[PDB]
């Protein structure tokens, strides 16, 4: 589901450290953590950023943020956790492939970045 | 009633104000008070969920749309280089108030690790 690395491990062409996965997205562990739990939930539809998402794209969206809420209960982050969506160069996104990023297992600070 | 028992609450039933951004009926958008960067603002849903751990399977579509809202109100307010969402869950997360809610960010460059 498209042409960047989160393609290569959505079709199963590299490993990687899988959580969870359904019919439409993955979840995994962030190859570079920046706190001691750190993953990521995706969408198998390639949307290259959130800026392009459609209105019909509603729901896939809220399911990338409901799997990250079970997948986090299931790493054990009851004491709480930060979600984030990266958009473009201000943004900071790393992957032009929408990724929801999941961090916890530490005390996240304000700002956000 | 309507909106919950939190300062979201209030400004969801109008009795603070906020500088509003866009209403339907299903959230609201409105700019932060203490803004981490030269454009931040908040989408949240009328409906009063305390927390994303606690949101049912149900409120999927509704979470989608307050990232849907965040993009279009990103793009009207003019942040073509980008932007960062957020949602703070609980203490780690530095949860302060206890009324689901997305964070929008932009107008500078955000940095890595996100806090
Ligand atoms: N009356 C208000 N109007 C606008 N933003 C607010 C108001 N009260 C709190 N906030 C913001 O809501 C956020 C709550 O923190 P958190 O729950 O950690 O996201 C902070 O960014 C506050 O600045």
Same mark, same amino acid.
């Given at each position: 589901?498209?042409?960047?690395?989160?393609?290569?491990?959505?079709?199963?062409?590299? @490993?990687?450290?899988?959580?969870?996965?359904?019919?439409?997205?993955?979840?995994? &562990?962030? /190859?570079? #953590?920046?706190? #001691?739990?750190?993953?990521?939930?995706?969408?198998? %539809? &390639? /949307?290259?950023?959130?800026?392009?998402? +459609?209105?019909?794209? +509603?729901?896939?969206?809220? &399911?990338?943020?409901?799997?990250?809420? %079970?997948?986090?209960?299931?790493?054990?982050?009851? %004491?709480?956790?930060?979600?984030?969506?990266? +958009?473009?160069?201000?943004?900071?996104?790393?992957?032009?492939?929408?990724?929801?990023?999941?961090?916890?297992?530490?005390?996240?600070?304000?700002? @956000?970045?």
């Amino acid at each position: 589901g498209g042409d960047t690395i989160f393609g290569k491990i959505i079709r199963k062409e590299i @490993p990687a450290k899988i959580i969870f996965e359904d019919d439409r997205c993955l979840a995994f &562990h962030d /190859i570079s #953590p920046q706190a #001691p739990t750190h993953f990521l939930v995706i969408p198998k %539809k &390639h /949307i290259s950023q959130i800026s392009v998402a +459609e209105d019909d794209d +509603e729901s896939l969206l809220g &399911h990338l943020m409901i799997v990250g809420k %079970k997948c986090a209960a299931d790493l054990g982050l009851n %004491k709480g956790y930060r979600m984030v969506v990266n +958009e473009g160069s201000d943004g900071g996104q790393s992957v032009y492939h929408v990724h929801l990023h999941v961090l916890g297992g530490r005390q996240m600070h304000w700002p @956000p970045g």
